[PDB]
Amino acid sequence: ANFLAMVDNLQGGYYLEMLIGTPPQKLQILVDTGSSNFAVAGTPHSYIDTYFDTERSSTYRSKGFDVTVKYTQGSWTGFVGEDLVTIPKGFNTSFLVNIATIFESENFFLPGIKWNGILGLAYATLAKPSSSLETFFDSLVTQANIPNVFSMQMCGGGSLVLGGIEPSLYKGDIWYTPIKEEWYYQIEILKLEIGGQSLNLDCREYNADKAIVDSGTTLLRLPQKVFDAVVEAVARASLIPEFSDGFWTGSQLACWTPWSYFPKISIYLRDENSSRSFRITILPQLYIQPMYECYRFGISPSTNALVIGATVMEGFYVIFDRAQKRVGFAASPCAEIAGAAVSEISGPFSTEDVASNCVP
C-alpha cells in the first residue's frame, strides 16, 4: 500500500469510491466499523444513482445462496458472490473479495444518502451468514501484504488509511485503549464528565449493554439512564436556559440569528496500563449540530449499546489496531471551526478509584 495516496480518499455519512468487477463499476461505499459485510445495491431503488450489475461483470461468481441482515430500524437481503475489487486511491492492484448484492431492503436506502453500499470493517464474528464469510479487510490484509491495522479521520471529506497510520493526520500523541471483545470494536468506558463534573453512575452503566466505536452510527448514542444523566448535567451547566425537552429528545431544533454557554463532554478510557486512563473531550460545536441557524442535539438514547458514533469520531484520528487488540485516539488537526479546536485529548489520570474492570 501507499498511505500518502489514501489521504482525502473519503467524501460526504462518509464514503469511499470503489471499483467492482471487470470492466470496473464505480460505487460509493459507506465506511462502517460497526458491521462486517461488504454489501452493495444490486437493483435500481429509490434514493440511489447507481448499483452493481453482476450481469455486467465478467469476473463475478455467484455462491448460489442469499443473505439477510436485520438491524433495529431495518434490514436487507442480497445474493452472495465474489468478485475483483480495486481501491483507486491506495492500491494499484485488485483483490478477490466476497460481496452481497442487495435485491430487497426494508428501510435501508433512505432519502438524501449518497452511498450505495456498505463496507463493514469489524470482525469476522459479526459477518453474515456466518463468520466464515471472509470479511473485506481480512481479504485485503492477506492479499495486499498490509499490516492488520486501519485508521480513520473524518473532517465535518476525510481519510481511511488501510494498513497503517498516516503521520500527517494528527499532532500530539496517540492514546491506546484495549479492545475488550473482538466483535464490534468494544472498549472500556470508565467515566463520563460534563463541564468538568463527573456523573455519579456506577461505571458498569457505561458498558452495560456495551461501548463500541462505530463509524456507521451518526450520533453519540447512550443508554437511557446514562442519557438522562447527561441531559440533566448539560441543562444544569449551561449559562442560560436555552433548550426545550423537545431539543433533548431530537424532536426540536434550537435557533439563533451562541457557544460559550455550553459545557465540554469528556469520555474516560482505560489505557493499556490499567492503572491509567485518558480522556477524549468534545466541545459543544461537535454535539450542538448545525442543520437564523438551527441546531440538532448530537446525542440520542439507546436501548442496545453505548455507541461512539461520528458526533465523536469527527474530533479524532481513530486507529483500529486489530493486530495489537487496541483502538487508538489522537486529536484531529482538521477538527476546527472559527480558529478553535472542537475536541481535545488528555492524560494520564489515575484509575485507582474506579473498579479494575467496568464491563459486566
Partner: nanobody, 112 residues
C-alpha cells in the same frame, strides 16, 4: 473449525518442485475463497496466490506467476499449490488461510 492443515513441504534443490495440500474442515469449503501465503524468518509475510470458491478465478503474486498453480478439490475439501522451478528465494513456511484463520503451515526449503 475453521480448521486448516498444510502438508507437502520438504527440502528441495533449485529448479525442483513440490505439491502442497491444505486439508480444511469445520466450515463449508466449497463456499470459501482460499489463499496461500508465505513467510521466511526475518522477512514480512508475502501473499502467494488466491482462488475463488468455484476455482475459476485465480490470482498470483508477480514473484510466482508462471511457476506456481493454485487449485482446489471442493469434494475433497482440499486446497493445492503446485510449485515448479523452485529457487532459493522461495524458502518459507507456506500457510493456507481463509476468513482470518490460518493452518500451522508447511516448510519449504530450496537449496544446494
Amino acid at each position: 473449525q475453521v480448521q486448516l492443515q498444510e502438508s507437502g513441504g520438504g527440502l528441495v534443490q533449485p529448479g525442483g518442485s513440490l505439491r502442497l495440500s491444505c486439508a480444511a474442515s469445520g466450515f463449508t469449503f466449497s463456499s470459501a475463497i482460499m489463499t496461500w501465503v508465505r513467510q521466511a524468518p526475518g522477512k514480512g509475510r508475502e501473499w502467494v496466490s488466491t482462488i475463488g470458491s468455484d476455482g475459476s478465478i485465480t490470482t498470483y503474486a508477480d514473484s510466482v506467476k508462471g511457476r506456481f498453480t493454485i487449485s482446489r478439490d471442493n469434494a475433497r475439501n482440499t486446497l493445492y499449490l503446485q510449485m515448479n522451478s523452485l529457487k532459493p528465494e522461495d524458502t518459507a513456511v507456506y500457510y493456507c488461510t481463509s476468513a482470518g484463520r490460518r493452518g500451522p503451515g508447511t516448510q519449504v526449503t530450496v537449496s544446494s
